[PDB]
Design a protein around this ligand. Structure first.
Ligand SMILES: *[C@@H]1O[C@H](CO)[C@@H](O[C@@H]2O[C@H](CO)[C@@H](O[C@@H]3O[C@H](CO[C@H]4O[C@H](CO)[C@@H](O)[C@H](O[C@H]5O[C@H](CO)[C@@H](O)[C@H](O)[C@@H]5O)[C@@H]4O)[C@@H](O)[C@H](O[C@@H]4O[C@H](CO)[C@@H](O)[C@H](O)[C@@H]4O)[C@@H]3O)[C@H](O)[C@H]2NC(C)=O)[C@H](O)[C@H]1NC(C)=O
Ligand SMILES: *[C@@H]1O[C@H](CO)[C@@H](O[C@@H]2O[C@H](CO)[C@@H](O[C@@H]3O[C@H](CO[C@H]4O[C@H](CO)[C@@H](O)[C@H](O[C@H]5O[C@H](CO)[C@@H](O)[C@H](O)[C@@H]5O)[C@@H]4O)[C@@H](O)[C@H](O[C@@H]4O[C@H](CO)[C@@H](O)[C@H](O)[C@@H]4O)[C@@H]3O)[C@H](O)[C@H]2NC(C)=O)[C@H](O)[C@H]1NC(C)=O
Lengths: 211, 220, 213, 211, 220, 213
């Protein structure tokens, strides 16, 4: 019948953009009924901002309600729990989805950056790889930059956080780069955004194609 | 494969709060109730309460009302237990458990590994390591050790010649002194004939205090 | 309501032993299912029986459960060394809406050869003496029945001041280990011309002894 | 009611161990009925080997049938399709799950191996990272070796295949290693097993902690 | 996000077989029928057939009976179409499509990007690149180009001064000669005043033949 | 059975145009749903209408569908440049168990300013002449209505031997482009003291011309 999902603010949104938001999605396979309410609240009792709202009846007959709530970074850091409560249809119990900052010890990531040896054929392209590890909570964002301008997201792929043997998480990120970029200027930064990185929630490493 | 992964051990001062976590893999977190069970050292299982992740509702046995708070972070597949006004007697292993049923009373099928919560007035302190010299040479073998003295919280690791020496090694469980600090001994049994030629180093690692000690152990 | 079990129960390999679980008419007596759990030292409980008599995937058939009126009973045939564990029952208790575990029973497997303990006794080292402290370290190992009694004597007079003895714990070879530590001032340790660690086990006593410089 | 899954032979099993097998799993939420048949066949008509079979009624009332079929590597390479057919309960249509070698062009992986700079604290540990890329079909196995003995699996983690920009896949693998290992002998191999690697379906790169 | 990802373009000789793939993300592959639709260049959509991934059953419009074979690899979330006895006229873009319904007739909601299948007697051949010199100097601007001659299969890439020159560039669609080989031109329009000082190189890349040509284009 | 649509249909921005889809009594006439798809050049079809009159998530309300008896009709109000696309209907056909697409209609949006074409004509280069081959390359761009006629003349006499002309194709600026290539032997090219490319578009003709050495 009804499924509901709520996302986490990305670290990039908490600490860089600094306008973080969370998104509550409801998927109702049989909208046989009237309105499906969906309501935000905070565990503390404090008020929430207004949220966007959007409904689509989908071609297969499913109804799809999305809602987006802006949250405070400071509130998020102090422990707020944000809650999306789904209400009405043939639901005895309401559904409720929630998100809060992860428990446990904190620990800034270590970043390492590596370049690929020239491969026959490629010549005009090179591969950069960034290993980011030992960070605690696994929440993390990753940017690559060049001429102190952040590259587009889709230029790189980053893997999902997995647990290291022992404690903390790691993550790999990969960016192909072109001769026109590296001769332009032979420096690329791999930057992680993480709540425990401290002055300002980031750690970065520079890497170069040649020596 | 279904797995309930619990967080590491917690060490608290009386009066504190701790939040330990139980993270779920292998089914839809929000489908089934999670139960929490306490077990004081050397004692029996006690059923604390249950949460329903789909909607956040909870229920507690009388005894834990007020001082345990069960929550669920659906966005991250995580059932949390929060213990407050901690007391010495709250020292126990706390387990989360489940059954992929719904509408079924007991017989939990899947269990986390347990999170130990230790409550004490003591403060973190690294060990002193004293060498426990071989009672001077001779017929066969001889015992030498390291006395790992006066440290808080427990777990201490002891290894010999950096892991290279493994045979004959016997590290004993700690004593808890009334000072509230712990002491222990690690003893290796060695051919008495090798005493003047083979080096014996003990490597003590006390992670909670971030202290590593390496100490040579020489015949008296 | 409490579900009550006998604190302990005894074995002898290949034999059949039972554990009982007694509630009242508001739980077991009320038609509610009983379940059973097995706990090995330092591990999480495992479910053995569920809904009275059913075994979950992987439990040997030598374990069985039955439910009488107000009681239920676990039966293990062909007792094995590895069955040595704690066992708990559970049922539902409608006056509290809970599903409590029973008081628990410690299964003990008989046979198991007796063993007297090894003892090692180290005097304070000179480094500690300089730290203006002194500890005699008495390490006791490899004994079965896991009960000892440590008494320290100073010369020939007992001490009973500042002695700390661990509880006994199973070593990997299924025998037991324990340590007893005795704190003295350097001047004490230097005063007497000897101290002794006396371990009493199963009515026999192993003493070991050490002296200053 | 009834779900069914069938796994793929790992390349490590096709090309190294050389006794590859596939596993058909059925999960039936309401075993209200009698027997659930599960039957192997090949698309070509040819006979199959005998398979292991195992049933467990699970505590929550689910019934679980697993079956394991050994297959030929040469047969697999020539295009065989293996099929697990699930039969009986309240199923009008039978269910059928199948597995076959992936379509399209082939291309051996490129392996690159990197070591981590000393990190304060660690000292006695180092991190190795292997980038494996441009391979086609995404099926791949990864071993790490030391003293020409293959390390245990659980010593390393490897990421899931993701598509490079343009063509082919990449994968990262990570292995922590200890001072006792690298002073013992300072060489570790990262080896990929892949159908297109040609003499013998493998490509490897050596890496060292120091220079 | 639901996605039907189709495989790259295929180029075949008459008489061949090709197997193109349609890989599914975002729902359970085995839940819903997949449909295949053909579209010859410049012509209309034609419904070929449907497969049911849960059980492998298929159905084909008369016209494609025999020469299209629809399969499904459940282990890898992949619906395959296999075209055989290929004919010139089998040259078309082949699409897979779906609707997350079950029990519903048409109106496909989700579509792959299309896989082009080209059938020809021709063999792979790299291009010749001839410089198309600026008709010697003058009033404003001047056109120079590269003639990319006699190559098979299509896609060719042409870039100028290694991507650095972008403005004024116009690369025309190929002509298909009766030899079955393709030819095309790339023309750049440049200030006539820069002719004696700025270098003009065209970079031709013909991936199918694994040929890269770089050619300077000098005034006559 | 075929579902038939008119091959083409015409616009003028902001206006309302209809496309029809006619089947028989064994498909549309039989109570089976009609759907509609929109295809832009070089892209996959997109679903616009489903089940007769329903719009999927994201389709402007200016698109509407109706189903009469044996026919169904798509209506676009407020015609826009971007609506210029191919449209296909679909329904179910029980005599074949299929769900065929209609013959398809090419929507043309009127208005759009006429444009005469630019022409560029390159002689063979000396490199090709050495390769013992010769090609005159006539590049035609930027014209609207996308129909041209290329004729090559050699001196003043027409050629019609070994001329190849592409179909016209939309460039990114919504005008059209095409190329015409003429193959000669070097001796031919050297024989005549000139060749010419004559592009005829919308009744007007642009010629350009080149000569040997
Ligand atoms: C009553 O309780 C029973 C008793 O436990 C429940 O049984 C489980 O039922 C679920 C759901 O039907 C079923 O999950 C499925 O598992 C299959 C098979 O796993 C194989 O395939 C994988 C190869 O690709 C491989 O991962 C796997 O081995 C391992 O899986 C995990 C997960 O990563 C590993 O970490 C670990 O090594 C484990 O051994 C096997 O080779 C899996 O393929 C299924 O597919 C997945 O579906 C989810 C959809 O959410 C996606 O996340 C994935 O992308 C993928 O498509 C799926 O996970 C279990 O196998 C059943 N367990 C047993 C023991 O029978 C039962 O559901 C429950 N009943 C009720 C009503 O709740
Ligand atoms: C009728 O048709 C409709 C119309 O399409 C179908 O709607 C879809 O319904 C499904 C199933 O209920 C639903 O899937 C779920 O999506 C949620 C939300 O996605 C967010 O969360 C992610 C953050 O963690 C993030 O990935 C995601 O963005 C992206 O998701 C994909 C997948 O990787 C990305 O590649 C892409 O960027 C996309 O935008 C959103 O932020 C997702 O979280 C759900 O959770 C997952 O469940 C599966 C279990 O198998 C696991 O694999 C995962 O581990 C995870 O737990 C789940 O995927 C769609 O969102 C619905 N789509 C729309 C448009 O409404 C409908 O089902 C269908 N009806 C029938 C009967 O078939």
């Amino acid at each position: 019948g009804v499924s509901a999902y709520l996302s986490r603010p990305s670290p990039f949104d908490l600490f860089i953009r600094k306008s973080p938001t969370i998104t509550c999605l409801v998927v109702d396979l049989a909208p046989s009924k009237g309105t499906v309410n969906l309501t935000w609240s905070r565990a503390s009792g404090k008020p929430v901002n207004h949220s966007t709202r959007k409904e689509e009846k989908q071609r297969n007959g499913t109804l799809t309600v999305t809602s987006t709530l802006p949250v405070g970074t400071r509130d998020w850091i102090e422990g707020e729990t944000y809650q999306c409560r789904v209400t009405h249809p043939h639901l005895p119990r309401a559904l409720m989805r929630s998100t809060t900052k992860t428990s446990g010890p904190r620990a800034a990531p270590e970043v390492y950056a590596f370049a690929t040896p020239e491969w026959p054929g490629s010549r005009d392209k090179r591969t950069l790889a960034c290993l980011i590890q030992n960070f605690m909570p696994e929440d993390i964002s990753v940017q690559w930059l060049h001429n102190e301008v952040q590259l587009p997201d889709a230029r790189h792929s980053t893997t999902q956080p997995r647990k290291t043997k022992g404690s903390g998480f790691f993550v790999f990120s990969r960016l192909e780069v072109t001769r026109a970029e590296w001769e332009q200027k032979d420096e690329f930064i791999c930057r992680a955004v993480h709540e425990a990185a401290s002055p300002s929630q980031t750690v970065q490493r520079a890497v170069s194609v040649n020596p | 494969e279904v797995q309930l992964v619990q967080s590491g051990a917690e060490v608290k001062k009386p009066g504190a709060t701790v939040k330990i976590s139980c993270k779920v893999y292998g089914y839809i977190f929000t489908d089934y109730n999670i139960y929490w069970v306490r077990q004081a050292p050397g004692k029996g299982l006690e059923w604390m309460g249950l949460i329903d992740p789909d909607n956040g509702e909870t229920f507690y046995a009388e005894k834990f009302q007020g001082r345990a708070t069960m929550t669920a972070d659906t966005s991250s597949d995580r059932a949390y237990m929060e213990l407050s006004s901690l007391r010495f007697e709250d020292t126990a292993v706390y387990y989360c458990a489940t059954v992929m049923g719904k509408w079924i009373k007991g017989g939990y099928d899947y269990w986390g590994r347990g999170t130990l919560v230790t409550v004490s007035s003591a403060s973190t302190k690294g060990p002193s390591v004293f060498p426990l010299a071989p009672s001077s040479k001779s017929g066969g073998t001889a015992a030498l050790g390291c006395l790992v003295k006066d440290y808080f919280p427990e777990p201490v690791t002891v290894s010999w010649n950096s892991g290279a020496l493994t045979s004959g090694v016997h590290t004993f469980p700690a004593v808890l002194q009334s000072s509230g600090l712990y002491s222990l001994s690690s003893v290796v049994t060695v051919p008495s004939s090798s005493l003047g030629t083979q080096t014996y180093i003990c490597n003590v690692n006390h992670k909670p205090s971030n202290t590593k000690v390496d100490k040579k152990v020489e015949p008296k | 309501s409490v579900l009550t079990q006998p604190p302990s129960v005894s074995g002898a390999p290949g034999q059949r032993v039972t554990i009982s679980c007694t509630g009242s008419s508001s739980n077991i007596g009320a038609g509610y299912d009983v379940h059973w759990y097995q706990q090995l030292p330092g591990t999480a409980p495992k479910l053995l029986i569920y809904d009275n008599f059913n075994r979950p995937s992987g439990v040997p058939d030598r374990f069985s459960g039955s439910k009488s009126g107000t009681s239920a009973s676990l039966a293990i045939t062909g007792l094995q060394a590895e069955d040595e564990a704690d066992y708990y029952c559970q049922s539902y208790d409608s006056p509290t809406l809970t599903s409590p575990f029973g008081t628990g029973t410690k299964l003990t497997v008989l046979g198991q050869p007796k063993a007297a303990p090894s003892v090692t006794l180290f005097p304070p080292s000179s480094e500690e003496l300089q730290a203006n402290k002194a500890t005699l370290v008495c390490l006791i190992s490899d004994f079965y029945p896991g009960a000892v009694t440590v008494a320290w004597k100073a010369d020939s007079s007992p001490v009973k001041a500042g002695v700390e003895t661990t509880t006994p714990s199973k070593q990997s070879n299924n025998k037991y280990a324990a340590s007893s530590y005795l704190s003295l001032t350097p001047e004490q340790w230097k005063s007497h011309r000897s101290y002794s660690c006396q371990v009493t086990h199963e009515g026999s006593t192993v003493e070991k002894t050490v002296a200053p410089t």
